[PDB]
Structure 1
Amino acid sequence: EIVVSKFGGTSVADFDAMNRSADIVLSDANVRLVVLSASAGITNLLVALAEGLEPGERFEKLDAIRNIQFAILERLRYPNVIREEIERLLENITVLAEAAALATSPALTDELVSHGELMSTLLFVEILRERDVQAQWFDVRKVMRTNDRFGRAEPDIAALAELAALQLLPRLNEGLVITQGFIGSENKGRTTTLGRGGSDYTAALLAEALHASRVDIWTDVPGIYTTDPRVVSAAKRIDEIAFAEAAEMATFGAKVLHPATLLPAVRSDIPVFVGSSKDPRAGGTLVCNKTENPPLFRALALRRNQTLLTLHSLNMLHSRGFLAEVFGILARHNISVDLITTSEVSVALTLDTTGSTSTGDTLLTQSLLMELSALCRVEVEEGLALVALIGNDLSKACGVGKEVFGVLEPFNIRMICYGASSHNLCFLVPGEDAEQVVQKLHSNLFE
């Protein structure tokens, strides 16, 4: 019986916002664990610095980073103590940025980028104690154990359970606990990150590990809509939806949720709430086990910068293996594909961006290619965008093909993958036409 609350960039971008969020945490006494991302802009600045920047640009970034932190600092009642700390963090960030300028790696990046959520959670506790509140700071790294895959580390569920009950539970009993999402620590103590947007994932993870009654995702939009409001102005809010529905929404482009948030949700039936931190009375969306009478079409999701890796065979093995093998190469290079389409011995692979914390993460390695290039002719098309329609029983229902492609006459559909799930129908279209399609569909579909 403990609700876990999560606040994103915008929700803790500055003192005021941080306050709006602090209020919310104190509107419900069941909120015992808070999860914060770093303030808006921090992570991008930090990532640009882990790329290795020259003296000039480097200094600009470090200052943009220091400003944001002091905007908040200079508003506190007793800014002396945390100033020391911030200075260390800032100073350390500085030395790391100097190192990045000479050598860089996904591990250095995770370590430097981790600093954002560290500074944000330190300040938040201060904003909470400035109100006479028992609120203590906690380093998730003591609990969030992950593998050594830097940039997008994967959580060790068992480990996260023992630890959380041995170091985090007692702290929850005593009082309030503020910690950071997105980061973790590997076996040999090195810092890791779960991948962009990972703060959502962290919230669901600790919720499961602590047997919480619920998780609250506080963002900059009141709930989950029928599509990105930034693309469809006329986007309608969705008051309530179910796990797999949303699970697939996130997976195909519903940025509001990290594609891995709901895994723990489903595994422990921990409903998740989604609302605006700047307007908690507009009302958000609740994600739960199962709904009332689920529509046929809930929403549309867009996933940009997709890559289409089409594989034809140099005709040397039998399809059985030609495939069984092809899939045993991606098993080594551990390249996961959400969408595949075939035609005899021609297999078109739909590749999503990494979502890794480190920019330079390049999916198609030359080792891979030459291994595949000889085993079967390769093809790679870029600047393609995936469009997904999520609903229910689309496979055993009528009029789906006409309803979706009746408006797309003027476009080039490059790939259509449908039939594997009664919840979705996806397809590719050239990047530039991406949004106009989302609009056209949504229109004669939800409006």
Structure 2
Amino acid sequence: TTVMKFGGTSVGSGERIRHVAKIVTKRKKEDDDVVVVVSAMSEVTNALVEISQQALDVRDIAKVGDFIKFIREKHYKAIEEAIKSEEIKEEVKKIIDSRIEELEKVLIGVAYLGELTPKSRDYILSFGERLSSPILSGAIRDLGEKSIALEGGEAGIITDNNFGSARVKRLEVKERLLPLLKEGIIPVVTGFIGTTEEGYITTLGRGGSDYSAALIGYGLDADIIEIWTDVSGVYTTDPRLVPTARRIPKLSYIEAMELAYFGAKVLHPRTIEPAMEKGIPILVKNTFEPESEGTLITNDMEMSDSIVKAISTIKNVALINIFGAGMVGVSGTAARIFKALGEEEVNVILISQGSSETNISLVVSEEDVDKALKALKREFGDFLNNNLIRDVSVDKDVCVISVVGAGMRGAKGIAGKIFTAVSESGANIKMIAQGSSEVNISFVIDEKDLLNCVRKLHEKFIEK
């Protein structure tokens, strides 16, 4: 049983979709049980995000119409360039048209109301995958193989209703997909969406298509989960930032999970857990260079000589420094800080506390800064005094660099190497986290020093 997932750029045009369909069809000959997971076409999810905000804010009906036509012409051209059979094009075009009708109605409905609830957002975003999957399914049929397009929910992914980033409650992947596989059918499952208990469409978070593939793999006790993307596996760092980056042939579950979590976009962080806990390997491959061995992610762990195996970054973060009111009890005031932040669903990436004043340093998701300040003000309001917090500063022009490798925590002398290197790059360290991870050290520097810092780190540990 092989589940194969294809990203945005991998299906960025009709030609590429056909190319993908060929890849899938070749696997069908090696393993007869093949399930496909497909993302929205290149750049459409972003367009759906921004039209959602436009329909809400400016409320221009003709700007919606402009959008619909951009979507129509992108997917029409895709159908035309991916499928040869006229009968099949005609079949796929109809499905696409039903989707565009619904999309149009909902965007107009949003404009008419001037309201865009989290539920409506998810519905709108799901159209990306619901428009691309039938085109790929059709192209697979066009190559003489049986295929139907399915949505995440009907493929067996049931979530709660925390729209925007629903968490998985329940799987019925066997129940939904096994009958189809038995008939020899290749299901093309929509990437980043699932369903509520009552059938409401739900998204799993940006980059969530990867996670879908892992869920389906998990559900089906698959032999392998294949991640097909636009680079040949997981590299020593992001090859679009540092072009001398090198493919890492083998990586462990925890190494990959930490990298993904800390900014190696190639994998959504939630991809690893389901595969990890059933020992299903993950093979990351390049659709544009399908001959490459890529990266195999399993249980096996090997330490590297220089120890640091890879470097990831997150640009979209803010450093929040909470200033405590003195010797007021760190666990007590941390209890209240994280209750407030947790209530507001603020996503904290990093914590450090080591201060006689009960100060604490946090890294949050940058877009969560306003929710965070609002939450802290609600909780604390405004030395003999009973007060716990004194003030709070934010720095948004900041980033998190992480360094990941097999024996990181245990490796004598590596911290000093990493930090002298950081210094020599011209960066000033604002925060360090070490201790909570077997394989990871993260730190915070100014956003402007990102590129230079990553390069120096790459030079010292990977290139030599």
TM-score bucket (shorter structure): over 0.9
* Higher helix proportion (structure 1 or 2): 2
Q: Distance in 1 between matches of 2:369 and 2:339?
A: 21
8 Å Cα contact 1:4/1:207 also seen in 2 = yes
Which residue pairs with 1:369 in the alignment? 377
8 Å Cα contact 2:11/2:41 also seen in 1 = yes
Deviates more, 1:235-244 or 1:334-343: 334-343
- Residue 438 in 1 paired to residue 454 in 2? yes
Which residue pairs with 1:248 in the alignment? 258
8 Å Cα contact 1:252/1:301 also seen in 2 = yes
Which residue pairs with 1:402 in the alignment? 416
C-alpha spacing 1:48/1:86, structure 2 compared with 1 (3 Å): same
Q: TM-score, normalised by structure 1?
A: 0.93
Which residue pairs with 1:423 in the alignment? 439
Q: Distance in 1 between matches of 2:12 and 2:338?
A: 44
Structure 1 residue 326, shift from structure 2 partner: 2.2
C-alpha spacing 1:293/1:305, structure 2 compared with 1 (3 Å): closer
Greater relative contact order structure (CA < 8 Å, 6+ sep): 1
Segments of 5+ residues of structure 2 without an aligned counterpart are: 383-387
8 Å Cα contact 2:151/2:194 also seen in 1 = no
8 Å Cα contact 1:198/1:258 also seen in 2 = yes
Structure 2 letter corresponding to 1:49: I
Which residue pairs with 1:287 in the alignment? 297
Q: Distance in 2 between matches of 1:274 and 1:366?
A: 41
Which residue pairs with 2:42 in the alignment? 40
8 Å Cα contact 1:414/1:428 also seen in 2 = yes
Structure 2 letter corresponding to 1:123: I
Q: Distance in 2 between matches of 1:28 and 1:320?
A: 54
Which residue pairs with 1:269 in the alignment? 279
List per-residue Cα deviations over 1:174-214 (Å, max 9, x = no partner): 12211111001112321110011000000001110111111
C-alpha spacing 1:211/1:361, structure 2 compared with 1 (3 Å): farther
Query: Number of residue pairs matched?
Result: 437
Which residue pairs with 1:69 in the alignment? 75
Q: Distance in 1 between matches of 2:379 and 2:300?
A: 45
Q: Distance in 2 between matches of 1:127 and 1:177?
A: 12
C-alpha spacing 1:24/1:404, structure 2 compared with 1 (3 Å): same
Segments of 5+ residues of structure 1 without an aligned counterpart are: 355-359
Q: TM-score, normalised by structure 2?
A: 0.89
Structure 1 residue 353, shift from structure 2 partner: 5.0
Which residue pairs with 2:117 in the alignment? 105
Structure 1 runs of 4+ aligned residues shifted over 6 Å read none
Structure 2 letter corresponding to 1:440: K
C-alpha spacing 1:167/1:411, structure 2 compared with 1 (3 Å): closer
Q: Distance in 1 between matches of 2:236 and 2:374?
A: 40
Structure 1 residue 150, shift from structure 2 partner: 0.8
Structure 2 letter corresponding to 1:431: E
Q: Distance in 2 between matches of 1:381 and 1:239?
A: 37
Structure 2 letter corresponding to 1:167: R
What secondary structure does 2:324 align onto? coil
Which residue pairs with 1:22 in the alignment? 21
- Residue 150 in 1 paired to residue 163 in 2? yes
Structure 2 letter corresponding to 1:65: I
C-alpha spacing 1:82/1:191, structure 2 compared with 1 (3 Å): same
C-alpha spacing 1:320/1:80, structure 2 compared with 1 (3 Å): closer
Q: Distance in 2 between matches of 1:362 and 1:97?
A: 27
Structure 1 letter corresponding to 2:45: T
Task: Calculate the aligned-residue CA RMSD, in Å.
Answer: 2.0
8 Å Cα contact 1:215/1:270 also seen in 2 = yes
